[PDB]
Write a protein that binds this DNA or RNA. Structure first.
Ligand SMILES: [Mg+2]
Lengths: 44, 76, 102, 62, 88
RNA sequence: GCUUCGGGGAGGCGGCAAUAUCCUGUGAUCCGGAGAUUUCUGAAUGGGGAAACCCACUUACCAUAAGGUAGGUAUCUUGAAGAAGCGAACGAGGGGAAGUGAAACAUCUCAGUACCCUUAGGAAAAGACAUCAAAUGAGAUUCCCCAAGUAGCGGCGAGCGAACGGGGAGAAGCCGAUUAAUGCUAAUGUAGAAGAACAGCGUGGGAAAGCUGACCGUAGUAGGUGAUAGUCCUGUAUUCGAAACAUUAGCGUUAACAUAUUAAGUAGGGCGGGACACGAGAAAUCCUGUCUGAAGAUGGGGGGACCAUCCUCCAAGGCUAAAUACUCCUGACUGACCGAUAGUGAACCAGUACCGUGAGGGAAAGGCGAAAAGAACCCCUGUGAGGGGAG
RNA sequence: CCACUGUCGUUGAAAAGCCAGGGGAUGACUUGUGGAUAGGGGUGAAAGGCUAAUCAAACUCGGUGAUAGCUGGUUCUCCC
RNA sequence: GUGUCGUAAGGCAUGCUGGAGGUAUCACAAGAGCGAAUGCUGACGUGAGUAACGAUAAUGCGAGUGAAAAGCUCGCACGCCGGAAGAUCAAGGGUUCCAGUCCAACGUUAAUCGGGGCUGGGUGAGUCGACCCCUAAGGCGAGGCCGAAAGGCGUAGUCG
RNA sequence: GAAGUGGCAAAUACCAUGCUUCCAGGAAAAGCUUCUAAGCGCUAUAAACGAAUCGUACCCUAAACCGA
């Protein structure tokens, strides 16, 4: 049956992407937190 | 924002206190009003968002004194 | 460092203690001295490159503190010291006597 | 080799750099076609190009 | 400028497709700089091979392959190649 | 990786990780100072955008074709100069929980804590009396030890909890105790240099251990080296170097900003809140949303309701070092701290694999040998795996 | 597109299916792509349904080592 | 492992293994003693060589290669789909595509085969699509309005 | 080294963004054609030269996507 993840690149990059993170103060805090943890993947 | 230009009055925080002494956070807002002040030195009306205390300060000190203080303060 | 490739040394520790040879290589703390510390290597033959293969006998690096420079006069193990001449030239010098040679 | 280039003027340094560019192209083509046995030459040509551009930068700055 | 055209051609392509393209149509296959246009490839070919005329340049980007070596997963560089048609 | 200036003196072209072509006393590799180059994304700044992409305008020059080189073009503030963004903790400020405790729970507690937001500096803040005291008075601020779990506050419950003063650290008072450069003089740091003295014999794979006898010591409990070394190596004690750049001070000078002249919408008051250890209380004192509103030195503020007397001090201008708080970092040193299920989550290609749309969660996994001397060759087998010989 | 009945399956082929039948099938229809509404909030032809296999208050992190008059466990030896 | 000593916790000696550290005594300090916590991590049992090997569309034989062939290749025959189980895409994936070579692991068996390993190759546009010009919903939004702060809204526009 | 043209049948494709009816009354903007404003090139005929960049393999009712 239909499952929860239905991938779409535009939708992924528009809800979770780098510019979407940088558009908000809270998204920039997400990025600051990911960089402080040292993640090799900042954004999808 | 809800800030008086000439006096600096802005919202205060405080408590609503019930008779049973229950505390709730509340705000105290300034008595802010729009008023067009006549300025002879410029022959014009300038509209300020001002408190009642600021209007009294206009009454005592003059619109010219208050206006030069606002201009020194910045926004004009 | 105090021993460089070319000079004749004598091994003062190890299985070849006593024998002398001339230095071939100094990597950092190891030293290769010809005719000393001979290991037997089982070399698998190679087709592409030019090596043949067999049971070879080659010298192995030993620790540089296991050898000493050989005094040309006294023919005994010696230490090295440095002498800055009046000309400003730095020369190795035998610790026992002091002659500039080696 | 750097003393051989520091005496040269900018006008001939530029032309020598262009010669080195053409040289690099031909080394690359010979490398791809398997005709350059002495493979140490490509690095020395690249570093000669770097030296020429450094000297050109110096002689143009002042 | 005449120093950018020396970097356009990174080297020829030697393969069966390249060999038979050369035999049948006399067309040269080059690995070219990742940023070279068809006009740049045309100018570079005509300058580095004196006496030839370019009719057509066909370009394509080929993605590099993933080749896990030892313990690591790594990938080869992408590259661009040009099919260059020359005057017969 | 390019240039240069210093160091250094025989090897070297980063690791896994070797191989090849080679470089190197015409001084390489390497180390320290300076410079040059420095794609694209990202504050990202020419416009736009699903980051690492798409699309431009314009000036000058060159080309003749469909371009190339060097620039310019965001916004805001201030009158060309600045700002932006990021990043530990500590500071100051604007907002501000609840779980919990009270053996329930609402006042109260938790706690002005967590968290959110703003913004500095090497510290910040505060600071020179409209402060206390009531003693023979003292004399700014901050921090520490006491005072003291006292006096108080408190459904007088649970709890909360001073001050005066004493002993210390540090001290300083001003009205320019500002900021940024540059230039001298001094010192430092950022590479380095020299640096003592052990042999014999036996055991042993190997000697540093054993036996015997020496030596150095301003250097003897360092790390290594084939077993445990003051005398084998690197070191240690000691003595020491700088072309260049940084930093710290002192001096001089410049250019930016600042330079009150004694303080009225102020003090005080009504109402509602808040802060004071103090929950409205007999409640001083501080702050202010709202409404008011003086005296102005023949005056005013405080001394815990309030009045009188007495003492004390002059608000409504600004500033001010130290003693205090901290650690993303640099250096030296230390540990009755751990030793691979421990210690960082992470000793290992770890914030990785893996899981999750995402925010986020989050591992496992060290050790041949002294040296690869990592087993030529032969045999079985499928040129496999694996083994048996040989070494 | 749906899901009325039954058998099967229930450590499944499957964390909701198969098979045989069943309903709607020009409509208040189904469906693609993009977008909007966010947690005491949303959305709901209303079942407290649904809001990423999570819903009478999502998820993640933090307060936080919440609290637990409750349950479990509590590691060497001998003497009184 | 063994012997021996003590009321016990335990001590002492010693053979074998091991190959570089240990520690008397007396003080001193504890991450100081484990069988249970449906405890935590790893390893390994029992179940048991048991159930199962994933659509009941289906296979037979002859050759080939190979260490080995029910499963690979070739051939003949048989069967199945055929509004698909054929073909072209979008989305998503990302080399899986093609050839050679290998068979440990992976493939629910074997494998000489493979979407597995390794090495090479392969994607060619003025016209197809994107980019580009244009706008929808909906975003962002010089100035503007609003709001303790953070921010919220919104014009021209600019994206989509 | 051959043939390659006649009948019939026939789409849900095309004419057709048409026609007819109905009510629930059916995107926008640009390209495009014209008109002028401020201000100070355009239309035909050709000839030569150009048209960049990115994608393109392969699966796609699937063993390559979402379901470990
Ligand atoms: Mg659900």
């Amino acid at each position: 049956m239909k499952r929860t993840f239905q991938p779409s690149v535009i939708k992924r990059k528009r809800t979770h992407g780098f510019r979407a993170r940088m558009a908000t103060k809270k998204g920039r805090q997400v990025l600051a937190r990911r960089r402080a943890k040292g993640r090799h993947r900042l954004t999808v | 924002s809800r800030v008086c230009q000439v006096t600096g009055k802005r919202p205060m925080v405080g408590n609503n206190v019930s008779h049973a002494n229950n505390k709730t956070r509340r705000r105290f807002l300034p008595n802010l009003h729009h008023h067009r002040f006549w300025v002879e030195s410029e022959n014009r009306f300038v509209r300020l968002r001002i408190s009642t205390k600021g209007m009294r300060i206009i009454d005592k000190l003059g619109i010219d004194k208050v206006l030069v203080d606002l201009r020194a303060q910045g926004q004009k | 460092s105090k021993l460089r490739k070319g000079d004749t040394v004598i091994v003062i520790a190890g299985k070849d203690k006593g024998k002398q040879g001339t230095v071939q290589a100094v990597k950092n703390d190891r030293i290769k001295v010809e005719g000393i510390n001979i290991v037997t290597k089982h070399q698998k033959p190679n087709q592409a490159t030019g090596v043949e293969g067999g049971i070879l006998k080659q010298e192995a690096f030993l620790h540089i503190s296991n050898v000493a420079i050989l005094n040309a006069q006294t023919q005994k193990a010696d230490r090295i010291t440095y002498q800055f001449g009046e000309d400003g030239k730095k020369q190795r010098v035998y610790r026992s006597n002091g002659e500039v040679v080696a | 080799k750097i003393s051989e280039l520091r005496d040269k003027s900018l006008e001939e340094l530029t032309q020598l750099l262009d010669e080195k560019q053409l040289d690099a192209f031909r080394i690359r083509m010979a490398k791809a076609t398997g005709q350059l046995g002495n493979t140490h030459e490509v690095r020395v040509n690249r570093r000669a190009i770097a030296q020429l551009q450094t000297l050109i930068n110096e002689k143009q700055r002042g | 400028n005449n120093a950018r055209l020396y970097q356009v051609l990174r080297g020829p392509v030697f393969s069966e497709k390249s060999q038979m393209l050369g035999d049948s149509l006399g067309v040269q296959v080059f690995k070219i700089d990742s940023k070279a246009t068809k006009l740049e490839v045309k100018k570079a070919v005509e300058l580095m091979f004196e006496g030839v005329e370019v009719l057509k340049v066909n370009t394509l980007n080929v993605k590099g392959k993933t080749k896990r070596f030892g313990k690591n997963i790594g990938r080869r560089n992408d590259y661009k190649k040009a099919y260059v048609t020359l005057k017969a």
